[PDB]
Amino acid sequence: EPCGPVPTENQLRWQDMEMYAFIHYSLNTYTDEEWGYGNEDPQLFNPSSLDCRQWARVCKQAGMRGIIFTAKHHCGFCMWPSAYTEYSVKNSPWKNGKGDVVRELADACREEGLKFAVYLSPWDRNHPAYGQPAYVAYFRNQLRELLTNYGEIFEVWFDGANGGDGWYGGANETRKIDRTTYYQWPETYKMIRQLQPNCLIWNDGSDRGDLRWVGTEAGNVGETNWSLLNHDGEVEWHMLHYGLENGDSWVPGETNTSIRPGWFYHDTENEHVKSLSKLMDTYYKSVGRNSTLLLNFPIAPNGRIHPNDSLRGIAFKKMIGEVFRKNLAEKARTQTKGDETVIDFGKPTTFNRFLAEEDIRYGQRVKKFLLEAEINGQWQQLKDALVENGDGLTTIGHRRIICFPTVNATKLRFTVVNTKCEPFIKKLGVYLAPELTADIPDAGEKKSSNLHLFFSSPTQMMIDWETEQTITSFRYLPPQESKDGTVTHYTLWASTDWSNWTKLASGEFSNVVNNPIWQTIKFQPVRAKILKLDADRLATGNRMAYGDVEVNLK
Numbered sequence: 003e004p005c006g007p008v009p010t011e012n013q014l015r016w017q018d019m020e021m022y023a024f025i026h027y028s029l030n031t032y033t034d035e036e037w038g039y040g041n042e043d044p045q046l047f048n049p050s051s052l053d054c055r056q057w058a059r060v061c062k063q064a065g066m067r068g069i070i071f072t073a074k075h076h077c078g079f080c081m082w083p084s085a086y087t088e089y090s091v092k093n094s095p096w097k098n099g100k101g102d103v104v105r106e107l108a109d110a111c112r113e114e115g116l117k118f119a120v121y122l123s124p125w126d127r128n129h130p131a132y133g134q135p136a137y138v139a140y141f142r143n144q145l146r147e148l149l150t151n152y153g154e155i156f157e158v159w160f161d162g163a164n165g166g167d168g169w170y171g172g173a174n175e176t177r178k179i180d181r182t183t184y185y186q187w188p189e190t191y192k193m194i195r196q197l198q199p200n201c202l203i204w205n206d207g208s209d210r211g212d213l214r215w216v217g218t219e220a221g222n223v224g225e226t227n228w229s230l231l232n233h234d235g236e237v238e239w240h241m242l243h244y245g246l247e248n249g250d251s252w253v254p255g256e257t258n259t260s261i262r263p264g265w266f267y268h269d270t271e272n273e274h275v276k277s278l279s280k281l282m283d284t285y286y287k288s289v290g291r292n293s294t295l296l297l298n299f300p301i302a303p304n305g306r307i308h309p310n311d312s313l314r315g316i317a318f319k320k321m322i323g324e325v326f327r328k329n330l331a332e333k334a335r336t337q338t339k340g341d342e343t344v345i346d347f348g349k350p351t352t353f354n355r356f357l358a359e360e361d362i363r364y365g366q367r368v369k370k371f372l373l374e375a376e377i378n379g380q381w382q383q384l385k386d387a388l389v390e391n392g393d394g395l396t397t398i399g400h401r402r403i404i405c406f407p408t409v410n411a412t413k414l415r416f417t418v419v420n421t422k423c424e425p426f427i428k429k430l431g432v433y434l435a436p437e438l439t440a441d442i443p444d445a446g447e448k449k450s451s452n453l454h455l456f457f458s459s460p461t462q463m464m465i466d467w468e469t470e471q472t473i474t475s476f477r478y479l480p481p482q483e484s485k486d487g488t489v490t491h492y493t494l495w496a497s498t499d500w501s502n503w504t505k506l507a508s509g510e511f512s513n514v515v516n517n518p519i520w521q522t523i524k525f526q527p528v529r530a531k532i533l534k535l536d537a538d539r540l541a542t543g544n545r546m547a548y549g550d551v552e553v554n555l556k
């Protein structure tokens with residue numbers, strides 16, 4: 003009964019995993035860097051307390067259905083005793099060079115009932131022949147090892163990220179490849195299919211794999227999300243984030259992000275494990291937007307996931323269970339006339355979530371829908387409160403969840419406005435999510451939790467919005483866990499065009515160490531799109547830290 007491209011059985015089961023974990027752990031875990039350069043010393047790999055069973059337990063307790071593990075990241079250090087390199091745990095002090103992290107994690111996923119997956123970085127900064135054909139054969143030999151010796155692999159991840167320069171066996175060169183042709187993916191893809199016929203291939207930047215990136219690391223996919231791409235030709239950013247309405251291939255998007263600002267463990271980020279409200283936001287913008295959530299939990303130098311991350315994951319899984327515990331549509335009278343479905347609760351009913359699912363076994367069909375609630379005898383249009391322009395009511399696909407201000411309503415109407423073919427709605431749901439407040443245990447809410455906060459480097463932090471903003475003040479809170487990167491001087495810029503621009507500040511945080519209270523920066527209202535905070539000397543370290551920041555508006 004189909005309509006446009008349809009997913010394979012593998013792609014259906016993957017989609018139903020809903021959330022699974024990423025785990026990043028490499029030599030740069032020990033150098034406090036997001037990337038390793040390729041000459042990090044394997045002697046660094048010496049955790050005091052490694053336990054892959056803890057990783058699996060933590061992930062399972064956050065509601066993850068599997069784990070994708072960095073068997074090898076960009077620096078090229080291998081987490082399993084490959085036959086093809088010495089740059090691996092064969093030559094680390096951990097278990098006297100006799101350990102295999104891929105094995106222990108595979109076993110632990112098995113023990114905890116989690117699916118297991120591997121990330122094998124195509125870009126390799128250690129290998130002397132990177133960018134030459136000999137590295138391609140090395141890559142495949144290693145991939146053969148991972149898909150032969152560790153049981154069932156649910157996904158294989160080929161990062162598109164490439165920074166050009168690396169140690170490269172001592173050459174210290176910057177090397178350029180043609181990403182469309184260098185890795186020779188088709189021969190590699192055949193091997194994957196042969197060794198692991200149930201495995202889904204994620205790739206970005208070249209030959210289409212079974213899954214696609216969503217074009218950002220922030221943890222969202224488009225409010226419009228077609229699980230389609232075309233098989234051939236270049237993929238624009240817009241196609242990653244929103245998919246392609248008439249794409250000739252089912253290539254569903256995977257929403258990847260970290261539970262911390264960085265992918266790897268950093269001590270200064272222990273205070274910034276994303277809050278419950280931020281993760282719920284990500285949930286609604288991944289699982290709630292026809293995607294899966296790939297949430298990264300990094301391993302600390304001691305070989306364990308940090309307890310902050312663990313506690314937050316549990317609070318997250320708990321809240322998701324609470325929001326969706328009671329489908330209010332279940333007791334209601336539901337009927338469909340034409341393109342209109344009315345859920346009649348029979349009495350005034352309080353809710354703030356709507357959920358629809360298409361039966362995507364038969365493809366993705368809905369292009370546009372409407373939501374109305376009958377409030378005091380009058381129909382009122384609802385919209386997606388998480389979408390800034392438009393009502394956000396376009397595609398549905400695997401699952402679409404719509405948040406809106408809580409209403410007290412006797413009926414809700416769901417209308418399929420536009421569709422490719424006759425829609426097959428497999429499920430409809432209505433729910434009352436509880437208030438997200440700071441005092442929820444382990445929620446970790448901060449004033450900055452849902453600001454788009456990132457750094458450029460350790461003098462400078464930046465904030466930005468989607469729309470343009472009239473900013474009347476800015477506040478800085480020093481770190482309260484430890485004082486390592488406390489900011490003493492500060493200068494603060496605003497901007498409308500990303501060109502850094504205009505200066506608000508010049509100051510000095512007074513007695514900020516012996517008195518870590520909120521610091522307020524005074525300035526005339528600026529219209530701005532971006533803020534820019536400079537650390538002008540850092541009290542005890544090399545990366546500026548903060549407890550929290552607040553941006554006030556008109």
Ligand code: NA
Nearest residue numbers: 191210211212
């Ligand atoms: Na393919």
Ligand code: NA
Nearest residue numbers: 279438439447
């Ligand atoms: Na909140």
